[PDB]
Amino acid sequence: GNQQSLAHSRLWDAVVGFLHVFAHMMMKLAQDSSQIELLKELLDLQKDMVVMLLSLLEGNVVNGMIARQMVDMLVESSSNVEMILKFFDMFLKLKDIVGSEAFQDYVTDPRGLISKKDFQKAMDSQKQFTGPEIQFLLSCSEADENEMINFEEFANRFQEPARDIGFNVAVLLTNLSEHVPHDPRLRNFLELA
Amino acid sequence: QWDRLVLNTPSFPSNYWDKFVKRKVLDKHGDIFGRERIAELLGMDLAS
């Protein structure tokens, strides 16, 4: 009774609005280092939101009505979901590139500080991020002085707070894929994630 | 450990249909490991 009532309720609209606000707020708070606590609290709220969805999708048969409703909601809120997935994968690839050897020979600094220009050249050599992504990563990077960036801290800044929300999103996507097969629209989200 | 010798030898792909492997590995792992590092490991010349 309660699950069907929520399914027919206006909850979805609220979900779409929260997705929009989350997607823009995480991107804005990432740039400034003084709002890390606010970013973590936002991530926790998003985690609780994904938990509620997961709970709304309890005990559904293959091709369930609630499942198709949530797929329709996702395709309605495609842009924000793509932004959030891009936010996760950019930092994942940033961690991998920081660990990679090419950046190690690019930095050329015993102090462990990478210049903005050299960082841009190293990313353009790795050829994994688009130009706007390079600019956004540079903006999020914190240069103490003379454009010297602490790449290790920059990479590890957003790792721990974003672990739970990423796992919840992955679990939700896996459940939706395994319970709603042969859906062309969901495959886009699956391949973006 | 013994197979490490023919990595740089020019005649590495002998007795095997694909003689363009070295190029394929260069194009596959050039971005991550480094194009110059791959060239040194495989004994190839980029300009050539």
Swiss-Prot record, chain A:
It comes from the Eukaryota. Coiled coil: none annotated. The N-terminus is blocked. It is found in: Sarcoplasmic reticulum membrane. Detected in skeletal muscle (at protein level). Fast- or slow-twitch skeletal muscle. Residues 101-129 form the EF-hand domain. The calcium release channel activity resides in the C-terminal region while the remaining part of the protein constitutes the 'foot' structure spanning the junctional gap between the sarcoplasmic reticulum (SR) and the T-tubule. Pore opening is mediated via the cytoplasmic calcium-binding domains that mediate a small rotation of the channel-forming transmembrane regions that then leads to channel opening. Belongs to the ryanodine receptor (TC 1.A.3.1) family. RYR1 subfamily. Binding of [3H]ryanodine indicates that the heterozygous channel is activated by Ca(2+) concentrations 4-fold lower than normal. Single-cell analysis of cotransfected cells shows a significantly increased resting cytoplasmic Ca(2+) level and a significantly reduced luminal Ca(2+) level. Cytosolic calcium-activated calcium channel that mediates the release of Ca(2+) from the sarcoplasmic reticulum into the cytosol and thereby plays a key role in triggering muscle contraction following depolarization of T-tubules. Repeated very high-level exercise increases the open probability of the channel and leads to Ca(2+) leaking into the cytoplasm. Can also mediate the release of Ca(2+) from intracellular stores in neurons, and may thereby promote prolonged Ca(2+) signaling in the brain. Required for normal embryonic development of muscle fibers and skeletal muscle. Homotetramer. Can also form heterotetramers with RYR2. Identified in a complex composed of RYR1, PDE4D, PKA, FKBP1A and protein phosphatase 1 (PP1). Repeated very high-level exercise decreases interaction with PDE4D and protein phosphatase 1 (PP1). Interacts with CALM; CALM with bound calcium inhibits the RYR1 channel activity. Interacts with S100A1. Interacts with FKBP1A; this stabilizes the closed conformation of the channel. Interacts with CACNA1S; interaction with CACNA1S is important for activation of the RYR1 channel. Interacts with CACNB1. This is Ryanodine receptor 1. It comes from Oryctolagus cuniculus. The chain holds residues 3975 to 4167 of 5037 of the full protein.
